[PDB]
């Protein structure tokens, strides 16, 4: 029994198939001009001239409602946030206020950092980000890399996101890490924005949300 549980803990010959990983970091396509079943799963607002900002606000609200329509638990306000730097005009509150008009802006080094620190082991399943290519082209995020880990010490690369034209909410469920659970299990998530569109300098963040599974008398 002792030997067998060690073997289950440490499978020597059982696991390693050929040891032939390609080792390149996998790249995710975010374009919204091609219609596919997989993209529809990750892209919610639907594929479509540039819409007017009031149309962007309208579709911003509809995407929030659609994402919240399904059986879900929102724990966006259940974690600590620490961006790389402020600009004294708008903290991350306007990023997490679920309002298109307001937004958060960083100001500092080019490799902008957004830190998400958790208090308890929460199993995130759907990662939601809203982008606005036409509304914020100057500060649009063009290159996104999402990390993972249990602590600031052991942060590791998870996925790439290249932005070409996404004027809507982006849903990011995770399946590569754990196929059995179809969800991510970490306590430490950080985001990087190393470069912007048309050689930008800073970056806004219109929306951000975290998803987890589980008449009257006045």
């Amino acid at each position: 029994g002792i030997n067998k549980v060690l073997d289950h803990l440490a499978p020597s010959e059982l696991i390693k198939p050929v040891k032939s990983c390609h080792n390149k970091p996998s790249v995710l396509v975010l374009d919204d001009r091609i219609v596919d079943a997989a993209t529809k799963d990750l892209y919610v607002n639907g594929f479509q001239q540039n819409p007017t900002p009031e149309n962007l606000q309208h579709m911003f609200h509809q995407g929030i409602e659609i994402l919240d329509s399904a059986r879900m638990i929102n724990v966006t306000h259940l974690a600590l946030w620490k961006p790389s730097s402020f600009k004294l005009g708008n903290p991350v509150d306007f990023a997490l206020d679920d309002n298109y008009d307001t937004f958060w802006q960083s100001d500092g080094g080019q490799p902008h950092q957004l830190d998400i620190m958790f208090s308890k082991r929460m199993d995130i399943c759907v990662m939601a980000i809203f982008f606005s290519m036409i509304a914020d082209e100057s500060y649009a995020p063009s290159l996104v890399k999402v990390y993972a880990g249990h602590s600031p010490s052991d942060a590791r690369f998870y996925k790439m996101l290249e932005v070409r034209n996404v004027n809507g909410w982006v849903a990011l469920r995770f399946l590569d890490n754990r196929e059995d659970d179809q969800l991510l299990k970490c306590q430490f998530i950080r985001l990087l924005f190393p470069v912007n569109h048309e050689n930008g300098k800073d970056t806004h963040l219109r929306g951000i949300r975290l998803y987890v599974p589980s008449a009257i008398l006045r």
Binding site: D7, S12, C21, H150, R156, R178
Partner: peptide, 19 residues
């Protein structure tokens, strides 16, 4: 002897497995 072969083996590049 038991734990040596598993050491530093990035076979299936998965974040759960990698951690």
């Amino acid at each position: 002897d038991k734990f040596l072969p598993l050491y530093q083996y990035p076979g299936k590049q998965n974040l759960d497995f990698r951690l």
